[PDB]
Amino acid sequence: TRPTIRPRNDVVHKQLSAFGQYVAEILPKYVQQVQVSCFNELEIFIHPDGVIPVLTFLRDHTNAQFKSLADLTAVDVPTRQNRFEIVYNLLSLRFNSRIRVKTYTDELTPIESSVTVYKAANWYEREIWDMFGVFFANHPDLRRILTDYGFEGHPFRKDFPLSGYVELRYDDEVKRVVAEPVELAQEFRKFDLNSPWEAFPAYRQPPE
Amino acid sequence: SDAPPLTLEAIKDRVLYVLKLYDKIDPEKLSVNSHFMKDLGLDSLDQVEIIMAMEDEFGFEIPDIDAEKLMCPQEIVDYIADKKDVYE
Amino acid sequence: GTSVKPIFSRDMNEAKRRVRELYRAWYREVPNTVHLFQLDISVKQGRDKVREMFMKNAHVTDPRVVDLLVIKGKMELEETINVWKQRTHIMRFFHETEAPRPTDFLSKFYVGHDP
Amino acid sequence: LKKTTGLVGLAVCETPHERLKILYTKILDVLGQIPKNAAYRKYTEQITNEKLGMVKAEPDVKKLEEQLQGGQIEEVILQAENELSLARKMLRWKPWEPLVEEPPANQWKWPI
Amino acid sequence: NLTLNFGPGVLRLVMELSGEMVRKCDPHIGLLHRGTEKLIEYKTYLQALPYFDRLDYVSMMCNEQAYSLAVEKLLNIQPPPRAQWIRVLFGEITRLLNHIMAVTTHALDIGAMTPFFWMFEEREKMFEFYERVSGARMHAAYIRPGGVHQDLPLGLLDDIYEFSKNFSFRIDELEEMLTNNRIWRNRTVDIGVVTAEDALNYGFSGVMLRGSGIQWDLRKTQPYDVYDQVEFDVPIGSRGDCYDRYLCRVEEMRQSLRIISQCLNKMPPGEIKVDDAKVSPPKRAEMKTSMESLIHHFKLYTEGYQVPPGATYTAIEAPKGEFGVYLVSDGSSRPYRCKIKAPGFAHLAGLDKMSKGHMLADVVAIIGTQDIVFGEVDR
Amino acid sequence: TYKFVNMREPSMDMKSVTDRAAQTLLWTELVRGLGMTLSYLFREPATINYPFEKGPLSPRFRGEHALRRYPSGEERCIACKLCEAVCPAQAITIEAEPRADGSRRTTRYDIDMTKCIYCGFCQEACPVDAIVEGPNFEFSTETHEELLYNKEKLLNNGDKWEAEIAANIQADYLYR
Numbered sequence A: 001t002r003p004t005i006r007p008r009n010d011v012v013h014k015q016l017s018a019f020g021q022y023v024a025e026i027l028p029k030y031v032q033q034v035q036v037s038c039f040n041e042l043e044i045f046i047h048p049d050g051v052i053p054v055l056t057f058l059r060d061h062t063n064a065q066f067k068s069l070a071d072l073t074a075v076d077v078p079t080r081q082n083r084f085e086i087v088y089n090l091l092s093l094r095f096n097s098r099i100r101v102k103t104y105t106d107e108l109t110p111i112e113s114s115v116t117v118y119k120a121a122n123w124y125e126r127e128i129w130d131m132f133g134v135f136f137a138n139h140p141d142l143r144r145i146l147t148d149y150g151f152e153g154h155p156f157r158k159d160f161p162l163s164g165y166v167e168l169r170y171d172d173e174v175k176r177v178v179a180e181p182v183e184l185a186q187e188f189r190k191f192d193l194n195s196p197w198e199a200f201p202a203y204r205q206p207p208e
Numbered sequence B: 001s002d003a004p005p006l007t008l009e010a011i012k013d014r015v016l017y018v019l020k021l022y023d024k025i026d027p028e029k030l031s032v033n034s035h036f037m038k039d040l041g042l043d044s045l046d047q048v049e050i051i052m053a054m055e056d057e058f059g060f061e062i063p064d065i066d067a068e069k070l071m072c073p074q075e076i077v078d079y080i081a082d083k084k085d086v087y088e
Numbered sequence C: 001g002t003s004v005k006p007i008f009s010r011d012m013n014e015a016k017r018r019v020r021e022l023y024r025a026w027y028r029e030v031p032n033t034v035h036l037f038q039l040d041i042s043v044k045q046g047r048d049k050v051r052e053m054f055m056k057n058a059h060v061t062d063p064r065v066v067d068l069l070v071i072k073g074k075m076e077l078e079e080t081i082n083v084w085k086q087r088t089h090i091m092r093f094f095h096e097t098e099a100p101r102p103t104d105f106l107s108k109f110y111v112g113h114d115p
Numbered sequence D: 001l002k003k004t005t006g007l008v009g010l011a012v013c014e015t016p017h018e019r020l021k022i023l024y025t026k027i028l029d030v031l032g033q034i035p036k037n038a039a040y041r042k043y044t045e046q047i048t049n050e051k052l053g054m055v056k057a058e059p060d061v062k063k064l065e066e067q068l069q070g071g072q073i074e075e076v077i078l079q080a081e082n083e084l085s086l087a088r089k090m091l092r093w094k095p096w097e098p099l100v101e102e103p104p105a106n107q108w109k110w111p112i
Numbered sequence E: 001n002l003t004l005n006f007g008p009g010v011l012r013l014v015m016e017l018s019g020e021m022v023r024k025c026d027p028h029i030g031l032l033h034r035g036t037e038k039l040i041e042y043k044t045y046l047q048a049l050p051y052f053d054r055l056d057y058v059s060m061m062c063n064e065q066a067y068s069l070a071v072e073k074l075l076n077i078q079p080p081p082r083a084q085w086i087r088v089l090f091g092e093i094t095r096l097l098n099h100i101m102a103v104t105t106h107a108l109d110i111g112a113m114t115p116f117f118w119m120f121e122e123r124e125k126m127f128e129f130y131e132r133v134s135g136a137r138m139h140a141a142y143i144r145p146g147g148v149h150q151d152l153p154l155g156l157l158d159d160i161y162e163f164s165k166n167f168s169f170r171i172d173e174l175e176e177m178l179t180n181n182r183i184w185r186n187r188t189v190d191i192g193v194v195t196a197e198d199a200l201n202y203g204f205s206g207v208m209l210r211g212s213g214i215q216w217d218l219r220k221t222q223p224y225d226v227y228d229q230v231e232f233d234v235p236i237g238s239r240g241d242c243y244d245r246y247l248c249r250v251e252e253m254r255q256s257l258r259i260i261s262q263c264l265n266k267m268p269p270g271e272i273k274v275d276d277a278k279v280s281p282p283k284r285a286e287m288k289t290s291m292e293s294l295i296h297h298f299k300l301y302t303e304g305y306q307v308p309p310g311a312t313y314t315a316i317e318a319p320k321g322e323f324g325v326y327l328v329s330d331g332s333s334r335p336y337r338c339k340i341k342a343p344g345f346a347h348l349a350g351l352d353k354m355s356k357g358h359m360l361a362d363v364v365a366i367i368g369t370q371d372i373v374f375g376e377v378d379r
Numbered sequence F: 001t002y003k004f005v006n007m008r009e010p011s012m013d014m015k016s017v018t019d020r021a022a023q024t025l026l027w028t029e030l031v032r033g034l035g036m037t038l039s040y041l042f043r044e045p046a047t048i049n050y051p052f053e054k055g056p057l058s059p060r061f062r063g064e065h066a067l068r069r070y071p072s073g074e075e076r077c078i079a080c081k082l083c084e085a086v087c088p089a090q091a092i093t094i095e096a097e098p099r100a101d102g103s104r105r106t107t108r109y110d111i112d113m114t115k116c117i118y119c120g121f122c123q124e125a126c127p128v129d130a131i132v133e134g135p136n137f138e139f140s141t142e143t144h145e146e147l148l149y150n151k152e153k154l155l156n157n158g159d160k161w162e163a164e165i166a167a168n169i170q171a172d173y174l175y176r
C-alpha cells in the first residue's frame, strides 16, 4: 500500500461492527440487515414499520444517543418492486460517530413521518414528497417546497425526462407568462460513455 | 307574510324553483317524485351540486354523511322539514 | 392475498366521500378565486373546468390512487386559497395560447410524422 | 456551586446526586416490566446499575463528572430522563419480538 | 392579525403579524431551484465537479473539497501531502471570504454599509489569489478528486503572506465600527435565542451550534486533510443570540488567519495530484510523448474514471456549517445519485421557531445571522 | 481547545459603574466610531480609473475562446472531439469530414457562449492546443445571436489574439 492508496483503519471498523450487532440485538423486530463499508461507514436496513421506534432508540439510548439528523433523502431504483429507498443519516456528538438507516417504500405505501423524533426532518420530508412522490403520514403540513406551483410530476424520478414536459415564456396577446409543450433548439446529446471490459472483479455478479 | 312559519308548501315551492334554476334539468320532465339517476340522467356530482344550491337558499349546512341519501325531491323536503322542526 | 397498507380510505366508499368533499370545496371556492385573481373567465367557465379536471380521473378504481389524488387536489386548493399562485398559474389550466392539435387521421397526416 | 453551565436552556441542578438516584431507580423499575430474555432489558440494566454504583460511591461532583464520562452533570440528568422516556416507549412498542417480515428477493442488492 | 407576503439572495416570506409582533413566519423557497442533483446524474464526476461552485457561491473551494473527499473515499485513493496543504490553505482563505461576506451583508442589512466596502477591498484581493492559481476569480474548479488541478505560481506564497499580515487591522476596524456600538448591540443582543437542545434537534450546525454553547467542530472532532496537524482555537458562545454568533464569526476569521500563517510556514514539496494516471490526468509532455499517457488522457477526458459501486456520506466544516454530500455510485463513470446537504436548509427551516415573539425588523437580523445563501438552499 | 467570546463579567465597583454611566450619557463609543470613519476619510481611495486603468490579471485567465494554428498556417484542430465530449455544459458542437487533401479537419465548430461556463476543460482536454480560452473579457454584445460563435468567428479570434495568447501559453505551459 503505497502513498497512492487510502489508508485503512481497523479499530473503527471493529467498533462499528460491534455496535451494529448490538443494535440488531436490541431491536430484532425491525432491523433486517447491518453492514459496515470498507471506509468505516455503518448502515442499518430496517422494515418500513420501524422508522419511528428505531430512530427514537438511536436518539434516546444512553449508548447510542444519535442527537443530530444530518440528512434525509430518497433514492429511486426502478428495477425494484419497492421503488423508493429512504435514507436517514444520524450524527452522535457524544460518541463522535455517524450512522445510516435505510428503508424501502413504493408509490402508494405511506411512510410514518419522523417529525416527532427529529424536527429537522420536517422540511426534508417535504422535499422528498416534492421530488419523488413518497407520501409521509401524520406530517404537520405536506406540500411542494421546491417545484413551481401547479407543477405536474416528480422531477427526481428516473422516468422523468431531464428537460421536463413544459417550458415557460411570455405572450403579449394574453400579456402574461404562459406554459407550452417543451421544444429545444438543440436536443441534449446522449453519450454512451459506459464501456465493456469490466473494471472491478470484486463486484462481479453471478451469471444466474 | 312578515314571518309566518315555514309551511310544507312554501318549502316545496322554493325547492322546485331552485331545481328549475339548474341548467341541466328541463322544467317539463322533473316532478316532486322524480329520481335524479334514471328519470333525469345525473351522476353524483350534479347531486352534490344540487345539494349545495339547496344549502345556499335555505341557509343551513348539510353534512355529507346524510346528504347522499337525499336522492329525490320528496326526501329532500322531508329533510328540511325535519331539520327546521316544522309539523303540519 | 395482495394485502396493502391504506392511506386514508379502507374501501371505495370512503374515497368517493373524500372526492365529494374536495369537489364541494372547489365548487364553493371558484367564484372567490375568479373575483380575487381578476380573471377574464366567468364563474361558469371555472366550475366547468373544475368538473372537467375531476372527470379526467373518473376511471381510477384503486382507493389508494383515489385518495392520493384527493391529497394532491387538497394541496392545490390550499395553494389557491392563500394566493400562493398568481394569475398565470391559475390560467395555465385553459391553454388559451396553445394551438388546437387535430384529432382525425388526415390532419395529422398533413402536419407531420406524428401518429 | 458553579453557575452558567454553558449550554443555553440548561439550568444548573442543585443536589444532582438525589435527582440521578431517583431517575436511575425509576428507570430500573420501568425496566422490571420488560421480559427477561429481551436484550434491551439486560443491556440497560447493566448500564444503569453501573451508573448508580458509580454515583453512590462518589460524594464529589467534579470527580463524579469525570468518572461518568458524560461531563456537565446536568446533561447527564437530561440523558437519564431521555433514557427513562425511551424505556417507557419501548415497553409500549415491544421490539424484542421476531422480525415483522423478510424484505423482497433483491430489495438490498446493489448494484441494481 | 394580518397576513402579508414579502415577495421578490431572493426570498418569499409569508408572515402573520399581530400588531408589531410576529406570529408565524413561513419561508417559500424554490425560486433558485435549477435541479442540480438531477443534472449531475447525466455528467461524469469531473463534469459534475463545477456544479459545487454554483452550489454555495460565497464558499466555493469548500464545496470542491467536500466533493473531492467524497469521490476519493469512494475511489480508495488519497492525494499527495502538498495537495492537502493547498486544499487547507485555500479552504481557510475561502472561509475568510465567506465570513467577510456574511458579516458585512448582515451589517448592511442592518444599515451600517461602510464595512461592506472596507472588507470588499480585501475580498477583491482574495479573488486575485483565486484567479492567479486557476484563472477564475470566483468559479475556480481548482480542487479536483485527485488533488488540485495545477501547482501554485512561483510568486503566490509571498503575496499571500504580504496580504495576510495586514488583515488583522481590517478585522480590528470592523470590530471598532460594530462590536461595541450600542445601536448594533441593541439590534443584535438577545435576538433569535436558540437553546442547545433545540439547536441539536432542529438539525443546526456550525456557528448556530457553537453560538449556543455546544463545543462541536468538524475540523477538530473529525479532521479530514491536514487539520489534525494545525493548531487553532474554536470560539464558543454563551447566550445563543445574534451578537454571540457575530463574535464567533469574527473570532473564526482570526483563527483562519492563524491557520493560514501555519500553512504558509509549513508548506511541503512534492507533486500536486495523485500519481495514478487512471484517476488523475498525466502531464501534457507525458501525454505528447508517451503512449500509455495519451491513452489515459483520452479515456479520462472522454469517458472518465469508473468509481467502484457504493454509497458514502462525506461532510466537511464549510464556513456556513456542516456541508455534506451523499454519493451513490453504481460502478460506472457517472454517479447514480448525488444528494447535497446544505446547512442553510435546516437553518431556514428553524427560522420560524427562532423568530417567535420578535418585531418585524428582527426577522431581517435573524435571516442575516443565519448566513443564508439560497444557491445551496434550493440546489 | 476553545475560547469564550462573551464570558466577561463587568466590574461592580464605583469607578467602573461611573465609567459606564459616563459612556452611556456622553456617547464615547459613538464618537470613537465617528473618529474611525473620519480617519478612513483622509486616506487614498482604492478606485482605479477604468477604462484607462485595468485590474491585474494572470496568464491562466479564462476569457473568450479562440482557435489557434501552427506556425506554417494550418489549423491545429484535428476533430478528435475530446473538447466536445468533456464540455460540462454541452456548448461545443463539432462536425468533420476528410478535406480535399485527405487531412482530418472540421467542417463545423460551434461554441455557444451563452451556454459555456468558462471552466477551461476544453482547452485542457485538447491534445494539440487547438482550442484555447483566450485572455479577452470585453466582448459584450447587443443581441443574443452574435454570442453563438461558429468556426469562422473562433478562427478570427485566434488570428486576432495569437500574439498574447501564445505569450500566455509560453509563460504558463510549464505548470501544465
Ligand SMILES: CCCCCCCCCCCC(=O)SCCNC(=O)CCNC(=O)[C@H](O)C(C)(C)COP(=O)(O)O
Binding pocket: B043, B044, B045, C016, C019, C030, C033, C046, C049, C050, C053, C054, C055, C057, C058, C059, C060, C061, C066, C069, C070, C072, C073, C074, C076, C090, C093
Ligand atoms: C379556476 C381554475 C380551476 C382549476 C381546477 C383544478 C382541478 C383540481 C383537481 C382536483 C384533483 C382531482 O382531480 S381528484 C381525482 C378524482 N378521483 C376519482 O374520480 C376516482 C373515482 N371516480 C369516480 O368514482 C367517478 O368517476 C366520479 C365521477 C368521480 C364519482 O361519480 P359519482 O360519485 O357521482 O357516482
Ligand code: SF4
Binding pocket: F083, F086, F087, F088, F089, F090, F091, F092, F111, F115, F116, F117, F118, F119, F120, F121, F122, F123, F133
Ligand atoms: S470552457 Fe468548459 S463549458 Fe466552456 S466550452 Fe470549454 S469545456 Fe465547454
Ligand code: SF4
Binding pocket: F076, F077, F078, F079, F080, F081, F082, F083, F084, F094, F125, F126, F127, F128, F129, F130, F131
Ligand atoms: S480537442 Fe482540440 S483537436 Fe480535438 S476537436 Fe477539440 S479543438 Fe479540435
